[PDB]
Every structure is written in C-alpha cells, then in structure tokens.
Amino acid sequence: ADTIVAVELDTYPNTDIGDPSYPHIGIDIKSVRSKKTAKWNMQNGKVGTAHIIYNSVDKRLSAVVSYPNADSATVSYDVDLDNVLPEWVRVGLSASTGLYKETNTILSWSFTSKLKTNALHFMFNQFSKDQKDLILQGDATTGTDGNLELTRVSSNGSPQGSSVGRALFYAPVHIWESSAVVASFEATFTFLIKSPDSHPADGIAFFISNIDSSIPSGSTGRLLGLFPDAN
Amino acid sequence: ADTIVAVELDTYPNTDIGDPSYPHIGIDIKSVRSKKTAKWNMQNGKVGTAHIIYNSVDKRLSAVVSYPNADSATVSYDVDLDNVLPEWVRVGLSASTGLYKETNTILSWSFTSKLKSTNALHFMFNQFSKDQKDLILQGDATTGTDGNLELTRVSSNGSPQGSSVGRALFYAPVHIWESSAVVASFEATFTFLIKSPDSHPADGIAFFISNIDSSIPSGSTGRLLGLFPDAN
Amino acid sequence: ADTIVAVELDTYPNTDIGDPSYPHIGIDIKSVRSKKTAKWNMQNGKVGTAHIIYNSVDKRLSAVVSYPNADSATVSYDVDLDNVLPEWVRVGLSASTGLYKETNTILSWSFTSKLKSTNALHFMFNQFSKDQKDLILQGDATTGTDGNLELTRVSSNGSPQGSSVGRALFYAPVHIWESSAVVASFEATFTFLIKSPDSHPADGIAFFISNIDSSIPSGSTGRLLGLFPDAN
Amino acid sequence: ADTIVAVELDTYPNTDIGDPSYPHIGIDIKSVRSKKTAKWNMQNGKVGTAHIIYNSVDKRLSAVVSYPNADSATVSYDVDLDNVLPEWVRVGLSASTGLYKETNTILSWSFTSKLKTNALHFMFNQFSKDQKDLILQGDATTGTDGNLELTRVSSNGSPQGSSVGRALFYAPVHIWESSAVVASFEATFTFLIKSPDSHPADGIAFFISNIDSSIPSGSTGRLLGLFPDAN
DNA sequence: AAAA
DNA sequence: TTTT
DNA sequence: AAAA
DNA sequence: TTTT
Ligand SMILES: *OCCCCCCNc1c(NCCOCCO[C@H]2O[C@H](CO)[C@@H](O)[C@H](O)[C@@H]2O)c(=O)c1=O
Ligand SMILES: *OCCCCCCNc1c(NCCOCCO[C@H]2O[C@H](CO)[C@@H](O)[C@H](O)[C@@H]2O)c(=O)c1=O
Ligand SMILES: *OCCCCCCNc1c(NCCOCCO[C@H]2O[C@H](CO)[C@@H](O)[C@H](O)[C@@H]2O)c(=O)c1=O
Ligand SMILES: *OCCCCCCNc1c(NCCOCCO[C@H]2O[C@H](CO)[C@@H](O)[C@H](O)[C@@H]2O)c(=O)c1=O
Ligand SMILES: [Ca+2]
Ligand SMILES: [Ca+2]
Ligand SMILES: [Ca+2]
Ligand SMILES: [Ca+2]
Ligand SMILES: [Mn+2]
Ligand SMILES: [Mn+2]
Ligand SMILES: [Mn+2]
Ligand SMILES: [Mn+2]
C-alpha cells in the first residue's frame, strides 16, 4: 500500500484502535496506532498552530501545537526516515470526519526542506479558487475566504460527517539521500476546528508519503485519510 | 501553441532572424527575435552566472550574466507579464545545438517567487542527482554526471554533440501574477559552463517561463533554442 | 550632516515645503521635498502595509502602500544609491507629530538585502519585545505595548501626543552597494496603524536608509518626520 | 566572567584538560572541558564544512563537520540554553594557536534564528576589507582573498603561534524567550586549516555568548579564545 | 466527556 | 563558412 | 602521533 | 485652520 509518516491532530478518542481517552497529538509510522501521543486541549473555534521538525543528525520527529494564551502540546519520536520512507516523497495535510464532524479549515501552510546544499520552500497564507501547486484529493477545496477546507462544509457553513480530504504539494521533495551530510524539514500550518456538536471528529494530520499516494478507500473517521486499516 | 518568455544566452548569431552579429543576451517574448539584446563576451570553458529579476511594480524584466573578474552584460525590457503569460506557469532552462555545438552544462539553479493578494515558492539546486524527481527533463537533458544538469548530449569525454535540444522544468507550477494582487516578484540564478573545441560555439541557453504543459516544440534544435516552433 | 534616503508615508500636507495638498507617499533623497509623490488614500485606524524595493540593475527605488480590499498607491524614482549613500548603512522606521497628532504604530517589519561581488542579511519582526536589543530606539520610540513598535508617544488609552519624534534602526549595518559587485537588492515590508481622533492627522511614517551613526536631527518633529534637520 | 556555549573543532589534544588523545569536535558549556566529544579526522589544507543546529523542542545541540569524499564527524548534547545563556546573545567564530600553529581561515559563515514568528538570517560567502556587520576581536582580519583569518598569518602566508582572534555578528540575537512556542538556530561555516608543521594547533569554534563578550586575556592555545581558565 |  |  |  |  502507500507508505505514510504523519503527525496527527486527533480530536476524537478511538480506544478500539489504541488512541488515549482524550484528544491527543501523535506520531504515526505506517500505522494509525500512534508510536507516541500527548494530551492536546483542542479549543473549539479558535485558530491554532502546528510546527513539525526533523533532521538527519538527531533523526527525531517532533511537533508542537499551540493556541493563543494557553500551554502548548508537544510529542517527539526517534525514527530514521531512511528506514521508513522512500528518498522521494510528497508532503500533505489530511483531515476526516465520521459519525461526528468538524470544520478542518487550514488558513496557512509553509514547508522548508534542506539537503547537503539543495533547498525547497513554499508558504501558503492564502489559497486561490484553483491552486495548481496543490493536488486536492477527495473532499478538499480552495477559494472559500482564501482557506483550504479539507472536509466537506455545506453552503450553510455546517460541517459534514463521513468526509475525507487531503492536499499534497505538487513537487516531490528529496527527504533523505544515502551519500548526504545534513537533511532537515520544517512544517507550519494554522487550522480552525469548529463543531456545533459536543463531539468533534476526527482531526488533521501533516503527512509525508510516496509521491503517488491516494486517499485509501473508506479512510473516513478514525483513519484520518491516511490508513486503509487500523493496524 | 506554447506561450514563452525567456532570457536567451545566445552564443551563435543567426542574422536570418534578427540576432546581432555577436554572441548576445536578450529578452524573448513569444518570439526568438529578441525584444532587446546586448553584447555578451562569452568565455569558452569558463563557469559563468546569470541573474533574472522582475516585479509587478516596475513590470521590468532584467538579466545580468557574469564571469569571474570581468565586466558583466545586462539587458532590460518593460513588459506586463499579466498581459503575456497565464497566471500559472512552469519555469525551466532550455539549451540547443545545430550544425555547430557546445556543452550546455548547468551547475546550479535557484528560483524565488513571492505574491501578496504573502504566498512564496523557493528552490535551489547546487547539485543534481541521477533521478531528480522535482525536475521534468525534456529531450536530451540528463542528471547525475558529476552532479550537473546536461541540457544537450555530451559524449563520455565531455565532447558536445550537434543537433541536440533539451530542457529542465521545475515540477510544481508557479503563481507568477494575480489580478487581485499588491506585489509579485521572481528572481532566478543559474551557473553554466559553455565549452566548444574551436571558436565557433552554438546555440545557447535560456531561462524560460511557459504554460505548465510546455514541451520542446518540434524541430526546435539550433537557432530556436528549444523554445519556439518557428522563427517569427 | 546625516545622508538620508526614505519612503515617506506623509499624512499632513505641508505646502511651505512642496508637499501636494493631499496625504501622499513619496521618495525623499537627502531632502524632505520628495523627488516624487503620489496620492495616498490613508484610512484612519485601518492596519495598512508598505513594500519598498530596489536593485543595482534597474537602480529604481519603488514603494507600494495598501489597505485591505482597496486600491493601493505606488511611487517610483530612478536613483543610483552608489552615488547617494555610503556603502555601509543602517535601516530604520521614523515617525513624527507636531501641532496635529496620530498613533505611529508598527505591527511588523521585515528586511532582506542580497549582494554578489552571495552575501545576505534578513530580519523579520512580527512581534516586538519589552527590550528589543537588535533595535536601536531613538527619541520617543518604545516596544512591549501589545508586542508593537510605537514610534511616537501614546497615552495609556492609546491617545496620540503632538510634538513627538521617534525612530527604530536595525542594530547591524547593511552592505547596500559595492563598487566590484554584480547584483545588489533590498526589499522592506512593514504594517502600520495610523489613528487620530478628528480627520486632521499628522505627520507620518518613513522607511529610511542612513549613515550607520544617524540620529534624530535636532527639532525634526512635525513636517521633518525625524529625518531632516531643515526643509531644504 | 563571559557566559559561553561553543562547538569546538579542537585539532590539538590537550590531555592535561580532558581532551581525548585525538583531534576531536566537542560541545563546550561554560568550560573548555567539552561536555561531549567525537573523533575528528581533520584534513591538512582541505576545505571542510561545519553545521551546528538546536531547537527549543528537543533542546539538543548537535554539530556535523565534513570534508569532500570522507565520512563526517557528529556530536550531540541535550542542554536547555534557557538555563545556560541570557535571552539576548551575540554569535561568533573563535580560533587560537599556541606552541603549535595553523591557518584558521573561514571562507563562508551563515546563521539563521527563528523565534515564535521573528527571524534573523545572515550569510557571508565573501568577507570585505572593512566588514562593519562583524566585530573583529584580537588577531582576526578580513580582505585577504575575501576570507576571514581568525589567527595571525605573516605576509609570507606562514601561520603564527600564540595567536587568538574572534568574529562576532554585530546584531544581538534573541536565542530563547520564557513565553515562546518554538525557537531554532542553524549555523554553517567552511574552514581551511593548514600547517606546514606535523603538529597543527589549536582549532576553531562556533560560539554563542553574552553580547559584550571579549577575548579572555591569555586565552591563546588550548583555551581557543573562549575561556579564561581550563575548569 | 458525561451519564448509566 | 558557404553562397550570391 | 611517534619515539623513548 | 489662521493669516493675508
Ligand atoms: O473527552 C473526549 C470526548 C469525545 C467523546 C466521547 C466518546 N463518545 C462516544 C463513543 N465512543 C466510541 C467511538 O466509536 C464510535 C464512533 O465511530 C464513528 O465515529 C467516529 C467519529 O466521527 C469515527 O472516528 C469512526 O470512524 C466512526 O465513523 C460513542 O459511541 C459515543 O457516543
Ligand atoms: O571557419 C569559421 C567558422 C565560423 C562560423 C561561421 C558562422 N556563420 C555565420 C552566420 N550565418 C550563417 C549561420 O548558419 C549556420 C547554419 O545553421 C545551422 O547551424 C546553427 C548552429 O548550430 C544553427 O543555429 C542553425 O539552426 C542550423 O542548425 C553569421 O552571421 C556568421 O558568422
Ligand atoms: O478645522 C479643520 C482643521 C484641518 C487642518 C488644516 C491644516 N492646514 C493646512 C495647511 N497648511 C498649514 C499647516 O501648518 C500647520 C502648522 O504646522 C505644525 O503642525 C504640523 C502638524 O503636526 C507640522 O507638520 C508642523 O511641523 C508644525 O508642527 C494645508 O495645506 C492645510 O490643509
Ligand atoms: O594525534 C595527535 C597529534 C598531536 C601531537 C601530539 C602531542 N605532542 C606533544 C605534546 N603534548 C602536550 C601538550 O601540551 C604542550 C603544548 O602546549 C602549548 O601548545 C599547545 C599547542 O599550540 C597549546 O594548546 C597550549 O596552550 C600551549 O601553548 C608536547 O609537549 C608535544 O610535543
Ligand atoms: Ca481518533
Ligand atoms: Ca542564435
Ligand atoms: Ca508633510
Ligand atoms: Ca585542545
Ligand atoms: Mn489517534
Ligand atoms: Mn539571439
Ligand atoms: Mn511629503
Ligand atoms: Mn578539546
């Protein structure tokens, strides 16, 4: 299948599949059962911020998710992405809903990759009606107040259940080389998760994948648009 | 047909199509007949450097080509690329040979594009791998040979072949202008090594912005530099 | 005296010194009498944005000032800063009030300078701390008030004071031009909030490049914008 | 005294002060006795490259020193620079010689700092005769083939013993804030260490210090222009 | 995350 | 460097 | 880093 | 908004 490494902003605890009993951030390595998690105090309708970092030296994938005027959440997992991912990858944001639902609004996404030096950088602070350096998969859309809406939102602004959508940057990234001195990537995105319901689901993920990655069929809900099963 | 705006490093004067009677740098807008040129003192087998710049304010496309410890060459043309290009483009390097030949070696290529309605794209190649998947290679272009980009065919001994044409396009489309936008800018830098046995080299290198789906137009070896289907 | 090149956001028309009879943006070169101006539709209490650009190729200094969902203003002047400025400079924001007054609030300031003989300097302020040690604060300028830079004096209730002048210079000198150099460029962006009770605001904000040792010239409140010792 | 955190490229083993019996790279925290070291195969007269990285998340200071076509060296030490350094600092390169000598030539120096976002970046690939965004201390000089020569080199190109010199970037850097989400810095420099003698000494360091840092008197040789004593 |  |  |  |  697809090979996936993601940082999940999981809003809906699924204990059936190893999620803690609380909204959490996790590092996922080729499984939705996160290799490490941390408690995350998600804030309904507040604009939040995610930072994902990694290098070839420390080989440590870390993330930090923040809101204005509140303690942030942070998770870290030592993994050699030489041993998980192919040298060439695409990077993306994925989001899903199931029985329960939420807006998965992205307001900004930036990415920097360095490899010795070769460099790639992009920054989206607005998203146009037809954003041709993005590959939109499933329910993802652009042009709605200059935002990226990963999951379906009706004309009345109401979020839909059983939705899944991703956004991949068009150009493949060189993420690791055998004969390389230093490699690093940084990712930042701002998100707005809103539910009128007292159960928000299912969350957002930054993800690196094989270039040809697709939404695995039925990967709505707990699977967050990343995984075909919950192993 | 393709819509093309290029900065040509033209090494071979083609008088049949308006090229001056000397190696020149020029701005080409939907034609190989440059809108403006300048004398260029090309140095056979010396590593040279090109800088291309533009913004939505001055709407002036300029370029500067340099060698170590020698006077540079410069050309400038006022053009609104809002009126010339589609909003969405790919950026590339093209090179060709014909009857006469030269190595069209690229050692480095960087590109920065910024657009405030800030959105930004930046890439920098200082080495090129055997399989460079964020480049679309067209015709004879190849990567992996001493970490370089070889736009036109080169034998095992580095000896250049005639009647060759190749381009390299960055994979991701670029937002180069928007109607509802305050400031847009791009800069491009690349280093090149043009080498010929004999003091008769051809045909040159170009930085080019095109429609995303741009391909090497049929027969566009030699004078046409991998950009133009005819010489209008 | 100080050697000054500025882009003025002049809110108060001073006819005694050649200002047009409207709020304007202008290029000032060693004089408060702008070398060129343009009408500027200032918006009282709206967060606005300024972009200043220049390169050694076009040798054209341009600026663009914008508000949300409204036509921008633009001004451009051809000047060789090789002939005007010293090689080594400091960059700054200046603001002043006189008889009439306004908040001169800066919310963000970024600067990029590149010079190939590539040498590069980049800074970006999106928040400003209580003690910002990579800024040299001159006169009434202060930091820490809601993470902003307040160039001129503002009461506890945000009410602006008259007869105020303040500047903020980046601490490190910038290499803005070299004799033996191929390409040099700088860009500057800052966001500002100009607010007055009453439709009579004064006196405005400027991005400025100066001799490293530049100080607020004596008496340079009001029309002189913290830049000029007299109005020549 | 001055507060110093450095990555030392130590070419001369001083066993009297805890250096291993081989040329090494080390992390120094307010002492020349490195908190951690690693074997370094220094190459006489070859242009080498150093990378220093750190973030507020992993709070891990790492470095990697490389030459063309040879295995690199890398060292890492977990330290919270909130607890070592002041919020405001200057960054610099220091080099020294003693009884034994070497050219301490710097050909390039770049630095990036990010703090949430506020950012500082500089890159020197050439150094002019009068480089006014550098504070040169002791024997450091610029203009000699566009290089930075940290220690004294005679008119005949011969390196001098008992030399010490540093180069600090002019503008102070915000390296950590109490109420901050993410902070990172990256540093790259290329160096050319050459000795006609069979004993090269004493090495090069990237260093962060109090803004007002000075060459401690007699910090030639083993002390590398950083430390007043060898505790 | 709160009630059965 | 060939062709008018 | 090599010899005493 | 005052002064010619
Ligand atoms: O502090 C945490 C508050 C979250 C609400 C507490 C849980 N409430 C709850 C559960 N728990 C079992 C979860 O599995 C059933 C839901 O499965 C479907 O819905 C989710 C959400 O969209 C999705 O991940 C699945 O794939 C599937 O579509 C209940 O049954 C209940 O109520
Ligand atoms: O013995 C000294 C040789 C020096 C070369 C002289 C070049 N001739 C020349 C021209 N105009 C005629 C050029 O046409 C050449 C034929 O064109 C073919 O070759 C070129 C080079 O690859 C290519 O551009 C064409 O498309 C075609 O393949 C001058 O003005 C001048 O000098
Ligand atoms: O009741 C409606 C009031 C509207 C204000 C009218 C402004 N007057 C005016 C001028 N020219 C005269 C301006 O001189 C004002 C005195 O100058 C002092 O105040 C200003 C503002 O701080 C400052 O620039 C000076 O340096 C000095 O402090 C027009 O053309 C126009 O309109
Ligand atoms: O594989 C490693 C090869 C390096 C040479 C082997 C050591 N040779 C050596 C020593 N060892 C004792 C070192 O302390 C004496 C030198 O001290 C003076 O010189 C150094 C170098 O410039 C400096 O760090 C000190 O501060 C002082 O100036 C010898 O005595 C000998 O020979
Ligand atoms: Ca879940
Ligand atoms: Ca030609
Ligand atoms: Ca005025
Ligand atoms: Ca030592
Ligand atoms: Mn989970
Ligand atoms: Mn031509
Ligand atoms: Mn004015
Ligand atoms: Mn040591």
Decide if A128 and B178 are in contact by the 8 Å CB cutoff: yes
Q: Which of residues 6-45 of A touch strand E (CB under 7 A)?
A: 13, 21-23
Residue type, A171: A
Indicate the SS3 state at residue B93. strand
Query: Which residues on chain B place their C-beta less than 8 Å from a C-beta of chain A?
Result: 88, 110, 117-127, 129, 131, 133-134, 170-175, 178, 212
| Closest nt by CA–C1' to B99 | F1
Closest residue (by CA) to atom 12 of ligand 4?
D14
Cα distance between residue A201 and residue A104, in whole Å: 10
Q: Burial, B175: exposed, middle or buried (Cβ in 10 Å; 0-12, 13-18, 19+)?
A: buried
D49: its two tokens: 């490259």
Cα distance between residue B73 and residue B173, in whole Å: 30
Indicate the SS3 state at residue C15. helix
- Other residues' Cβ atoms within 10 Å of the Cβ of residue B54: 25
Rg, chain D, Cα only = 16
CA C57 to chain centre: 23
Q: How far is CA B124 from CA A54, A71, A181, B107, C220, in A?
A: 20, 37, 17, 11, 46
| C200 Cβ contacts chain H strand, under 7 Å | yes
Decide if B51 and C116 are in contact by the 8 Å CB cutoff: yes
C108: its two tokens: 């963000």
Q: D76: which chain A residues are within 8 Å (Cβ-Cβ)? A: 57-58
Cα distance between residue A28 and residue A37, in whole Å: 9
Distance from CA of C17 to the nearest CA of D (A): 36
Instruction: Give the chains touching B; criterion: ≥3 Cβ pairs < 8 Å.
Output: A, C
Q: Residues A63, A123: contact at Cβ < 8 Å?
A: no
Contacts of D118 (CB under 8 A, 6+ apart): C124, C125, C126, C127, D174
Please name which of A71, A51, A180, A22 lies closest in space to residue A115, comparing C-alpha atoms: A180
Peptide bond into C203 cis (omega under 30): yes
Please name which of D151, D129, D160 lies closest in space to residue D203, comparing C-alpha atoms: D151
Peptide bond into D202 cis (omega under 30): yes
Q: What is the dihedral of CA D142, D147, D151, D156, to 10 degrees?
A: -100
Structure resolution in Å? 2.5
Q: How many CA atoms lie within 13 A of C177 on its CB side?
A: 18
Closest residue (by CA) to atom 22 of ligand 1?
A98
A18 phi/psi in degrees, rounded to 5 = 95, -5
Q: Residues A190, A48: contact at Cβ < 8 Å?
A: yes
Torsion sign over Cα A172, A173, A175, A177: positive
Which residue(s) pair with C104 in the sheet? C194
Q: Which helix (H) or strand (E) holds D82?
A: helix D81-84
Peptide bond into B203 cis (omega under 30): yes
Helices (H), B99-214: none
A222 phi/psi in degrees, rounded to 5 = -50, -25
Tell me, what DSSP letter sits at residue B159?
A: P
Which residue(s) pair with C24 in the sheet? C10, C39
| Structure method | X-ray
- Other residues' Cβ atoms within 10 Å of the Cβ of residue C4: 26
| Closest nt by CA–C1' to B199 | F1
Strand A36-39 relative to strand A24-29, pairing? antiparallel
CA D74 to chain centre: 15
User: Vertex B107, ends D44 and B192: CA angle to 5°?
Assistant: 120
For ligand 3, say whether the CB of C223 is within 6 Å of any of its atoms. Answer: yes
Cα distance between residue D121 and residue D125, in whole Å: 13
Please name which of B35, B7, B11 lies closest in space to residue B223, comparing C-alpha atoms: B11
Contacts of D212 (CB under 8 A, 6+ apart): none
Peptide bond into A202 cis (omega under 30): yes
C111: its two tokens: 């600067």
- Other residues' Cβ atoms within 10 Å of the Cβ of residue A41: 12
Q: What is the dihedral of CA C62, C66, C71, C76, to 10 degrees?
A: -10
Cα distance between residue B205 and residue B183, in whole Å: 29
**Separation of CA D21 and C1' G1 in angstroms?**
9
Decide if D64 and A57 are in contact by the 8 Å CB cutoff: yes
Query: In chain B, which residue's Cα lies nearest the Cα of C118?
Result: B189
Q: B116: which chain C residues are within 8 Å (Cβ-Cβ)? A: 49, 51, 66
Please name which of C212, C223, C204 lies closest in space to residue C136, comparing C-alpha atoms: C212
Q: Residues B12, B203: contact at Cβ < 8 Å?
A: yes
- Protein-covered nucleotides of chain G (CB closer than 7 Å) are 1
Q: Residues C18, C24: contact at Cβ < 8 Å?
A: no
Cα distance between residue D63 and residue B107, in whole Å: 28
Q: How far is CA B123 from CA A16, A173, B108, B111, in A?
A: 43, 10, 11, 5
How close are the terminal C-alpha atoms of chain D, in Å?
13
DSSP string, A137-150: EET-EE-STT-EE-
C59: its two tokens: 């040798």
CA D186 to chain centre: 13
A158 phi/psi in degrees, rounded to 5 = -85, 125
Decide if D172 and C171 are in contact by the 8 Å CB cutoff: yes
Cα distance between residue B48 and residue C182, in whole Å: 12
Q: Which string of b and e fits D194-225 if b means at least 16 CB within 10 Å?
A: ebeeeebbbbbbbbbbbeebebbeebbbbbbb
Strands (E), chain D: 4-10, 24-29, 36-39, 47-55, 60-66, 73-78, 88-96, 103-115, 118-124, 134-138, 141-142, 148-149, 164-169, 173-174, 183-194, 203-209
Indicate the SS3 state at residue C196. coil
Q: A65: which chain D residues are within 8 Å (Cβ-Cβ)? A: none
Cα distance between residue C85 and residue B202, in whole Å: 43
Ion ligand 9: residues, CB within 5 A, are A 10, 19
Tell me, what DSSP letter sits at residue D199?
A: S
Strands (E), chain B: 4-10, 24-29, 36-39, 47-55, 60-66, 73-78, 88-96, 103-116, 119-125, 135-139, 142-143, 149-150, 165-170, 174-175, 183-195, 204-211
**Separation of CA C167 and C1' H3 in angstroms?**
34
* Residue B203 is assigned to a ligand binding site: yes
Cα distance between residue D44 and residue D21, in whole Å: 18
For ligand 4, say whether the CB of D14 is within 6 Å of any of its atoms. Answer: yes
B21: its two tokens: 């009677």
Residue type, A29: I
- Protein-covered nucleotides of chain F (CB closer than 7 Å) are 1
- Other residues' Cβ atoms within 10 Å of the Cβ of residue B206: 27
Residue written as tokens 């998980």? Answer: A84
Please name which of D53, D84, D12 lies closest in space to residue D183, comparing C-alpha atoms: D53
D224 phi/psi in degrees, rounded to 5 = 65, 20
Closest residue (by CA) to atom 9 of ligand 4?
D199
C109: its two tokens: 């300031």
Query: In chain B, which residue's Cα lies nearest the Cα of A211?
Result: B133
Number of domains in chain A: 1
Residue written as tokens 């030490």? Answer: D77
Q: Residues A51, A39: contact at Cβ < 8 Å?
A: no
Cα distance between residue D224 and residue D204, in whole Å: 7
Please name which of A202, A198, A196, A194 lies closest in space to residue A219, comparing C-alpha atoms: A202
How many residues appear in chain D?
231
Per the structure, the complete domain to which residue C222 belongs is given by 1-232
**CB nearest to D171's CB, from C110, C125, C134:** C134
D27: its two tokens: 């992390």
Query: In chain C, which residue's Cα lies nearest the Cα of B74?
Result: C57
Task: Point out the ligand 1 atom lying closest to the alpha carbon of residue A161.
Answer: 22
Cα distance between residue A74 and residue A62, in whole Å: 7
Q: How far is CA B141 from CA B8, B137, B207, B221, in A?
A: 17, 6, 14, 13
How close are the terminal C-alpha atoms of chain B, in Å?
13
Q: Residues D31, D46: contact at Cβ < 8 Å?
A: no
* Protein residue closest to E2, using CA and C1': A198
Q: How far is CA B181 from CA A114, A143, D190, in A?
A: 29, 15, 41
For ligand 3, say whether the CB of C21 is within 6 Å of any of its atoms. Answer: yes
